[PDB]
Design a binder for this molecule. Sequence first.
Ligand SMILES: Nc1ncnc2c1ncn2[C@@H]1O[C@H](COP(=O)(O)OP(=O)(O)OP(=O)(O)O)[C@@H](O)[C@H]1O
Lengths: 1081, 78, 145
Amino acid sequence: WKVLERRARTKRSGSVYEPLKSINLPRPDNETLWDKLDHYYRIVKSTLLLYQSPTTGLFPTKTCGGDQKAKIQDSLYCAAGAWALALAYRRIDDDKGRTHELEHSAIKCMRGILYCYMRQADKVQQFKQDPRPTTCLHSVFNVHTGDELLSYEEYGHLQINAVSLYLLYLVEMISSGLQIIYNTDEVSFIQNLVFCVERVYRVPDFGVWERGSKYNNGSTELHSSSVGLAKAALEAINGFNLFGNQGCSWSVIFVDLDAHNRNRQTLCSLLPRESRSHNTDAALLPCISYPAFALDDEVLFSQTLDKVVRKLKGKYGFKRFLRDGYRTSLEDPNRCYYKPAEIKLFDGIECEFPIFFLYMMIDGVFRGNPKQVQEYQDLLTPVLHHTTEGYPVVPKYYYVPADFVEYEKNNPGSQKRFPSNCGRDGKLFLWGQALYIIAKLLADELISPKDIDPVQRYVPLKDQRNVSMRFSNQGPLENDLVVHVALIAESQRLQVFLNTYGIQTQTPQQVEPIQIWPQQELVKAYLQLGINEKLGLSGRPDRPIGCLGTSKIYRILGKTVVCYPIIFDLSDFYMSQDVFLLIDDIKNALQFIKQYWKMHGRPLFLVLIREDNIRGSRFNPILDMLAALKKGIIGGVKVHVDRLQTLISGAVVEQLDFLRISDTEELPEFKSFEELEPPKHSKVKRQSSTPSAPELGQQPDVNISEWKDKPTHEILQKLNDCSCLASQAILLGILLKREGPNFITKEGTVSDHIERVYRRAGSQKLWLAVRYGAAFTQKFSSSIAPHITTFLVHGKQVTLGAFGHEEEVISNPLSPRVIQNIIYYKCNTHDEREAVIQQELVIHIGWIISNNPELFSGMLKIRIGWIIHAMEYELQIRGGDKPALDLYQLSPSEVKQLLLDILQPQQNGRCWLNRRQIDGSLNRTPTGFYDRVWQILERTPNGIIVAGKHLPQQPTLSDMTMYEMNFSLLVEDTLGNIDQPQYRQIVVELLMVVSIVLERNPELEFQDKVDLDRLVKEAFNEFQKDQSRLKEIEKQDDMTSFYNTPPLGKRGTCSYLTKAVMNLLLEGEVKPNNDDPCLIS
Amino acid sequence: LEFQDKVDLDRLVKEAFNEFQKDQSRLKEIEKQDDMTSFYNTPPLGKRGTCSYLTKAVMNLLLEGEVKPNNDDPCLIS
Amino acid sequence: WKVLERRARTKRSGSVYEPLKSINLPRPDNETLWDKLDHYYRIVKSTLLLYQSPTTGLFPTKTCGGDQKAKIQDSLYCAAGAWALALAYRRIDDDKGRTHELEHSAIKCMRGILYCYMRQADKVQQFKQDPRPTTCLHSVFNVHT
Ligand SMILES: Nc1ncnc2c1ncn2[C@@H]1O[C@H](COP(=O)(O)OP(=O)(O)OP(=O)(O)O)[C@@H](O)[C@H]1O
């Protein structure tokens, strides 16, 4: 180092003036880099590269016995290790022809994987349309011929993490510089593979462990690791060029932002756990380590790492997950599936995998924590095995001997475990060996972290500034996005009308170089992208484009393209006839764009103004919204308004060159948006608002319970001579139900008449009539399915059905056709207006949870019918002495407003009965109440019975944990049998009191099963006796006076509840705790 | 829970004795007898010990009075 | 930081399963980045950007006495300061039209230096052939013309 190097003080001491360089610096232990690299090359060639089939380049999973199966993940890891060794050898000019061999080792493995995948193209086509385990790509192929080996009935073959890892590794090696993909057919295949990958967030997967779940009963559940790997692969493949340096504009892969956003939303909420049944697992390590680096949070990552280290760490290695029976002593090697209560026997004897020590060392090296790397190196050193030549071997796992299982269970970690079959000479673990080679290369500073991560998957805390779709320029802790807003008016007349009121707008005739397209044209253009007639490929499926996809600017066939959001188009529903709903939707879209924008450059937003919604009393809200837009801030979001030509100038454009490459003889025509010519008959020059009052009021005089058995001629005459719109619509509904839609009426066919009545009622703003028409037409909105899938993404279940009747649970995402069938074929016994109100409610709640998820904290499942019952009760209570008006005529604006008023966290004021009814209908529970239920369940034998349903104690404890979401679902299902919301709240209050008493008094225990109904009845009796003694009131039935009592206070409900609980508890045995020093008590 | 007014031990002892006498009469069909010769023989822990009657009586007295919720504890609706 | 951020142990102590994010982390001394950047902008405007000739954009070496000389290195360093301040301001979306002004200031200083150098092309030609102090580019130009 400095001062020591010079040592040139020939005479005493003095200042020296001469170059020192660095070659003359003292050198460490005398060993050239060539010797170390040759040693690594030897231990690689003799152990890892020795097992590779030249025909396909696929590494076999077994090194003995002539096994033909070969996994994909192991081959990918071996290729990664070979590529790392090639990068290590790259540092030497005279390589003696060794870098090329390892580089093509990686190349050949990747090409074999690609060939095996491309042998199944019909499987890709089927998975694109209906992704199911029966129609998924195989994960195990023959090691000699590249042929399928195991059928769907014995392996499942549903593994997406392998595909995601393959794509990410391909991106990494191509970015580092390689030649893997040759022609355009491979480009199309990879593009359609990415298309299949886009829809990971809905389909359950078997997971990396190929078991499916802890129970191992052939069940598929969503896994955090798979979602994270898919998100990382999508991030890497966005805008990436597969041809390397020698590439053009027609070799790029385009990724939809909506799928990435959905994956991120589905990941960032389930990440603290692994799945519904797995609280923690060791498979989360690759998701947040060197494979993926898909967690850009640095707090959730720390929490997950701490949880994993606290739970699954062992001295031999890391267990896969708690209660695992993989190759354990107690496992029975003749049955593929497990049994209920069997997994309890696998506690304390779980196997440990040493490869997670290598994973930890790699993560520590990447983060820059030498102490952790050294500690894990010392921990991993004694568990290594050497061959005859001395080459280290990493055992696959360690298993307890069958004789010592009892001793291990009594005191974990005391006994000595035995190495697996692949932990000595003769059998080897290629994945573990490649991991060890990579870890040793990285820990010895032979590989820089940048060399193995060209795409910069991992960034430090000081570099989370400018990454596409990962961080915004402001940073990861700030969001003040500014949205560019351009106003578009249809005709010059509308532009003049807006300009006369201080609003400046541009028309399509004034932006001639700029073409405005709807979403359909963009969808059609993206459909033509993935066309490959040689293999058979349909390209991108016909799906709508979200707000994120419509915020860019595209250049198609040399013409710039701008697309307005899907909010501005209306197809069949009457929700677009309210300007307030449009304003709410545009505000929600602006907030969603601001919250979930991570691209480069300000997003472009187009506003469409239609003459149909500036007419009448609705002109003022539109003018106010336009003034707010012009001011600069709308709904807490800052916006900028300027000319479109200036905005598009100097901005980043999107290139769609695949259209030119298409071999179609005739180029498809796209209809851009056009200026609307003015009428030559009426010549309406955008007149004033003119409120006026050409409306009347009358209630319908006919109900379905009366005009049912009346004859055809009389009902036809009544329809002819009547004028009420709602009464009319009722008569046409009856006519369609009985006489058929094709019946010929006085004014034409029935259906035409009902459509015309719906149209005029919507024009005249008669909500009852339009809702009746929509109910009788069985009309459907395409926005329900995205709302339902967003509901299911957030981990919240939805149930449709009338209050106090049959309901259906949507466990998993499903096609819109089945949703329509369920909604319109399960409410036949009730009025069809329930379906329409359910659609409105589900859309509103979906939008609210998309924008404000905090409003729904504490509730798991959403019941539309119970919320409607609470809606009606709230309308009644605001009615007071005067009866409530109606629920089906208050209009969607007031429906949403008073629904928001219902959704308030607290409603102090009116008596506790109303609050109890509202809370019970909304299905709101205290935080952690399910943990209290679990504690009671452990401390209460024989289970708990309520509302007829009985919940057992043995299988729940033996199969299931404290924090498992399965317990949440089971408790919700058990407690949902109660029909009265107030009774449900009484039950939950009793459960909370029981939990508090049990925790505060550990000595007491329940002798037998507890029946909550008996305790409720005893509380009734005690409260009635108290009231009769206090006021001399004769005993009365029904809960009508018990709910009104405040829960806490003087003679509250809680007091009677705890009195009954203690009376029951003291009836049983009292076991004294010897630990407590309280004597003679 | 707090005591509303002054406590008197004789009343609690009498109530515990009456509860024990009623329990014995129900269990073994034994007529009520004066003096606590049988009450003292009961062990102070286990099945229907004297501790159970004493804690039942004191809890019944406590729940008669007002219950003040502590805002420090995060337990809600309790 | 970690462990301190959660503070969600409502009942004694136990493992929690909920997102924590980083926005809820404790914040240092409360001061918006806009306020500090505005303070820096005022300091720059009142001291450095005040003395700049509109004709050429060359910063004068003297702030008083009506001196006409202007060095090149000082102007380059002033442009460096303006560019650095603009880069610092670039982190905000709503700059109120301030980043563009400093980006200009840098552009104008560079263009003034370039114009002053371009005014002497025969000097460059002579420097190419026989580099001598008598045939070298000038280093001090007029601040106004
Ligand atoms: N009316 C709408 N309002 C808002 N976003 C919409 C609307 N219609 C479609 N989208 C967006 O378009 C995409 C919807 O995709 P698509 O309709 O193909 O099905 P999905 O969301 O994958 O699920 P599902 O199986 O329920 O249809 C999502 O980005 C959704 O946000």
